[PDB]
Amino acid sequence: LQFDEYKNNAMAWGTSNRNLNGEYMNFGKSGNAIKTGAGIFEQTEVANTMYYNTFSLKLLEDALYELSASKLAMDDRLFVIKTGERGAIQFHKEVLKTVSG
Amino acid sequence: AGKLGKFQMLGFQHWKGLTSDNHLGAIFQQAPQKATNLMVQLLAFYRGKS
Amino acid sequence: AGKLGKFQMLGFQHWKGLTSDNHLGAIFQQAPQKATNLMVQLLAFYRGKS
Amino acid sequence: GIRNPFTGQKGNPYMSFDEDSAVIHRMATLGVCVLDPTRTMSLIPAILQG
Amino acid sequence: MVISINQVRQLYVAKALKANTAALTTAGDIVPKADTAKTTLYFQSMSPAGIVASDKINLKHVLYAKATPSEALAHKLVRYSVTLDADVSATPVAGQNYILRLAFRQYIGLSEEDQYFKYGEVIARSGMTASDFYKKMAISLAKNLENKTESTPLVNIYLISAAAASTDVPVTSATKESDLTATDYNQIIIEETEQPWVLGMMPQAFIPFTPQFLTITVDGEDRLWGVATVVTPTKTVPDGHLIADLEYFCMGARGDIYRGMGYPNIIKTTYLVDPGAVYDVLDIHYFYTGSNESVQKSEKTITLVAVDDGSHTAMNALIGAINTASGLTIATL
Amino acid sequence: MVISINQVRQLYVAKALKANTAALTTAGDIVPKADTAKTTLYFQSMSPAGIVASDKINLKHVLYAKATPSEALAHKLVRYSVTLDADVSATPVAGQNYILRLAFRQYIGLSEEDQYFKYGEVIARSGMTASDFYKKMAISLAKNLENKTESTPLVNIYLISAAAASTDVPVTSATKESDLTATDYNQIIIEETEQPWVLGMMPQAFIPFTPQFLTITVDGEDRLWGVATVVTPTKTVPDGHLIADLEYFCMGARGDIYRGMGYPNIIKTTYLVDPGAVYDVLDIHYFYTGSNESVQKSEKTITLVAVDDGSHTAMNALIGAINTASGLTIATL
Amino acid sequence: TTIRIQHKVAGNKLNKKLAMGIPMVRNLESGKQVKDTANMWMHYVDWEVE
Amino acid sequence: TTIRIQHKVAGNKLNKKLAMGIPMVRNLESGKQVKDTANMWMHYVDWEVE
Amino acid sequence: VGVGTSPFYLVFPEDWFADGEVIVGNLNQVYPFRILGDARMEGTNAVYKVELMGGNTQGVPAERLQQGERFSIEFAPVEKELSRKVGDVRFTSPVSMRNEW
Amino acid sequence: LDTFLNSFPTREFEDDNEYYWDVIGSSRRNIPLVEARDENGVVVAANAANVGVGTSPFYLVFPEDWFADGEVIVGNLNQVYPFRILGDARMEGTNAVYKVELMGGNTQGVPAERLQQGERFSIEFAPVEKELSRKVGDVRFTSPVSMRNEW
């Protein structure tokens, strides 16, 4: 079980320790470098990432329309947003506030 | 020791004992693999030919 | 005009007009050919099994 | 040492030490590849950046 | 990088001037050689493996010879001063979401169709002054644009106070509210930055941008929030990475066209240009025509590169040696 | 140049010695860090892409630490003094052919079974003295050995005038005996030369030699005409081509093992050793033992190289910074 | 309106094969770089002249 | 007279392939390298201990 | 506290982590902490010699190392050559409740 | 956590070597302006007068030699001020200075604020005369990049 959680925590929450010169920065017990490669969340957050303080529909609709007008066709602009339970209520309050206007 | 022409790149190499991954990489027997089916096309909406 | 990964050592390259052999080797489209039939064994009278 | 509780082998033909203990060792190699990171869009709260 | 040529371009590095052939001892030396009847000019240079010469320029057949400084080959990093539109509202409206878009245009590939959009946002509140807005939106832009996770440097952003008015205080993604303590911030400056450079494989190329504003509801209409004006640049990318990629290309003319292709078996050409120094560039552009019915010309150019110390000491001594030897009036730069 | 390892070996170029982590600003900086309890030693250094620390050396688990000067690692070139055998005849006997066979033993291949021979011949005359013999012998040797279009140089030929007796008179293939005017020559010095070198691809190697003599008919007796003794060496091959190969190998234990292989698809490592500069080497050899049953040692070493100018300034300051931090007693060269 | 174009190549490029260390691409009319597999250089010159 | 030998290889050299930038050679008893097409590094370790 | 890649010590009220393990703070994979030995004990407290993983040249902030920060286990990365033993496993126990008349 | 990780497929490799692939991009560019000079070589400031009065020649400096002999190139305002190049570039280092003109029937020139640093220029076409025209225009190439991963 503990070896199963090691495999899954490395596939998502993995962080690379190599320089831009090519050198690794952490060495093992035998002195050879620990060659760690990144995971799902580290390799994918190096582009297209927004760090917001408060969420608004004016932010996300503009973030997803300047993206889609530049890169996607007309019939290709379907965005399935993966989120949590609290992010759905935060989504719900903004499209309530937009429709109430 | 020496060269057989004007342009010889390598000299002969030798070592003793424990071989590591750079012992093979300094004798040119360790190369990255080309993943040919993996290919990235950068995403854009191309408005030439329009 | 930047980098997409950490280890992107190549940038997109471009030029105009007349193309030289220098222009083709700098875009990595010229390489020396290996004569596989040509192999040289260094001449000596080997006496190690003697 | 003498016995192996991981397998149930009482007695040892090839002893590692004399402590009368048992150690298990496991290893694995793994990897993940994300081809294009510009094709995933993320909005993260600012308290999670650091 | 790969440059265009007018049928050839060859480069020689002028690390020193020796004035005769017998003084060529260290590499990188140059001697402008000519005869008394000024019909032939050439440059004897000391390569890392022996004395080498150039093509023999016919001095009736030059087309131009003009040398450029190191201040004319430095890319100026473009600035944008982002402020509040006083016609819209001098202070921030206490309810609205204030969003700023940065429209990048040469993200990872060459075209103007490979775009990238980054954002900063401030929810404005009651009693928030115009200075506390810029303290809060330079923090929001820095967490998006100067973060530690991004693959490439995108912009450098700064705050300018009203007391100092010229000095930049840099705001990073690790900068807190308690570091920026001034009540007289009047603008936000978004400046271009230098992209990474690998010798001969990744050229010097820049990502341009445009700060764009979203619309806030002021009275009943959605007015665009701000105005962004191009400020005159204060930071330049130096000349070293352009010339080191210019030796590397023009060295293949006189040498091996494949630089590392197939690596057990390469011919390691040793280069003499330091990528961390600024250089002056002199271009003699000439041709060849014979005394026959074949009167068409074969255009050629020879580049000479010398270090610039700020007063152009090495290049003007190189120019002056060519002027006496060859009888050409190359302009002192 | 592949070397042997006891286990993994790491090298760190000490181009400047600082006193804090914060002072590390240029590629090549170093600082030895330790505790105030002296139980852990590591080397923080400035890589060409940021700050990087070394492994943590347990100061109880060190085996040896020794510092090697530059002149210990300088190869002394082998000299051979060829004279006429005084027992045979101190003057050349007339009409005899004086042939000398230089036996090379590690010519291009890597063994003693790959051999090569170069000859020199002089047929003696009626009034030929000893000095006129050594003149024509060295003209004939340099004509065979040091032709310009050989593959590699093999040995250098030097006459010695008996009046000078300590200054080498260089004899090449372009040398005529009109240039060699001295009348008192007493020996011919044959001295091996430094082979070419490419970092990583071609190691520093030498082709040794012995001069051998064919017999002459002196008084009805076939006697070999000369003797060849080995005089003390007067030249040294400097340390720089040995340490740059020591860095090219040890930058795959930290960095990339694939150096160049799929050529544009590589990481390129920046090497901080100038191959035309001498260095001093410090080898801190240490090990690791595990907690309870993991008592096998992982015996490894951390190499440090510092450029030194005559008197070893940069290494003795490096050792003095290690000795006050670690509590060690590394001796100062 | 009368227009004109011109391109010049050396005679060394008659049968010049491309040892593709990186793949050789064609510029499309749409603006997309498409990967191509023909190894002759004048197949790519005749694409861009048209 | 009694003699002994030893040689340690790392554990990761079990199925370590050689990338063959140069040919991989095998020292013979006679004192001659002969080139070999075996792709595994353990094929060359097992020849040397013998 | 972890400038360059420098060792520093993390004090926990129990021995729950193992040698060679990566542990993370509240900002989990931004600052991954690698255990550099065994937990030398101080009463019930177990102090851990710790260096930072990733390419973390800047260090770990002092407000990310205060009393109350919730740490968890990630994995134990090891080198490709001459690797040595790391990691461990953990166990639990239940509780009970009663009633009357 | 694994139900998140089981939405991603598995791709199977032969060894624990670094692997690389090809990243392919785009081609439709334009070139920024460095500085503009009139016919006697004076750099055109923003407060200057008009530069191409009466189809007078003047100069445009670009960071690279992307343009050709006879091509019409246009600035930010496309087709309002079309500039036809006159002659090949004189390479001032890594700086191609083109002597240009003003087509379209333009008599009173181009304003000076349309010729500043950062003004982008793209290629329209290369128009020639009907009688005794000489060769103009040129042909351009591009090349891709690569990326990499480990274990």
Ligand SMILES: [Mg+2]
């Ligand atoms: Mg992303």
